[PDB]
Enzyme design. Sequence first.
Site, PDB file in Angstrom:
ATOM      1  CD  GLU A 187      -3.119  -0.720   0.048  1.00  0.00           C
ATOM      2  OE1 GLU A 187      -3.055   0.344  -0.600  1.00  0.00           O
ATOM      3  OE2 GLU A 187      -3.981  -1.595  -0.184  1.00  0.00           O
ATOM      4  CG  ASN A 243      -8.485   6.616  -4.612  1.00  0.00           C
ATOM      5  OD1 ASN A 243      -8.893   6.724  -3.454  1.00  0.00           O
ATOM      6  ND2 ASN A 243      -7.394   5.946  -4.915  1.00  0.00           N
ATOM      7  CG  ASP A 271     -13.554   7.983  -5.902  1.00  0.00           C
ATOM      8  OD1 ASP A 271     -12.434   8.438  -5.596  1.00  0.00           O
ATOM      9  OD2 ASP A 271     -14.202   7.276  -5.110  1.00  0.00           O
ATOM     10  CB  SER A 315     -11.835   9.356  -2.468  1.00  0.00           C
ATOM     11  OG  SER A 315     -11.404   8.201  -3.155  1.00  0.00           O
ATOM     12  CG  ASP A 371      -6.571   5.350  -1.260  1.00  0.00           C
ATOM     13  OD1 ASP A 371      -7.760   5.666  -1.016  1.00  0.00           O
ATOM     14  OD2 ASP A 371      -6.256   4.498  -2.111  1.00  0.00           O
ATOM     15  CG  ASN A 401     -10.871   6.072  -0.329  1.00  0.00           C
ATOM     16  OD1 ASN A 401     -12.077   6.080  -0.486  1.00  0.00           O
ATOM     17  ND2 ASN A 401     -10.043   6.729  -1.134  1.00  0.00           N
TER      18      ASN A 401
END
Length: 129
Positions: free
Chosen positions: A35, A46, A48, A50, A52, A59
């Site tokens: 990660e 991301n 969309d 958002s 992380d 997220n």
Amino acid sequence: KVFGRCELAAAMKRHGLDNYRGYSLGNWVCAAKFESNFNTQATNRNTDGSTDYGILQINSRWWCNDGRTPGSRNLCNIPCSALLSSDITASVNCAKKIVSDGNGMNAWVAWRNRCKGTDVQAWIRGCRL
Ligand SMILES: [Cl-]
Ligand SMILES: [Cl-]
Ligand SMILES: [Cl-]
Ligand SMILES: [Cl-]
Ligand SMILES: [Cl-]
Ligand SMILES: [Cl-]
Ligand SMILES: [Cl-]
Ligand SMILES: [Cl-]
Ligand code: NA
């Protein structure tokens, strides 16, 4: 902060993640590796909109507030920035809530794709725990 493998394992164990919801410490270290490459300051946007955050790439759509993810929730009730600290407490407490929400560690796509079904024990092998 960029953690060493055994160093993170030890911090994770101390914050009660070892076998949390039945997931051995090796799973958590492996998920952190893929990660964030053990970097507490890792962030990634991301598609969309958002973002992380942190060592476990939590997220903003669901778990933390970053003030720029319209219609998102903040289920861990923390600023997303708190997930970027050298102290992993906030990331651990949030991960505990995430892994408990029904789908286990499958919530972490890199864990599903790169850790699940593998020799995760290798990630804590040799570590003084
Ligand atoms: Cl490593
Ligand atoms: Cl393990
Ligand atoms: Cl922005
Ligand atoms: Cl927001
Ligand atoms: Cl919320
Ligand atoms: Cl906030
Ligand atoms: Cl820590
Ligand atoms: Cl599970
Ligand atoms: Na949010």
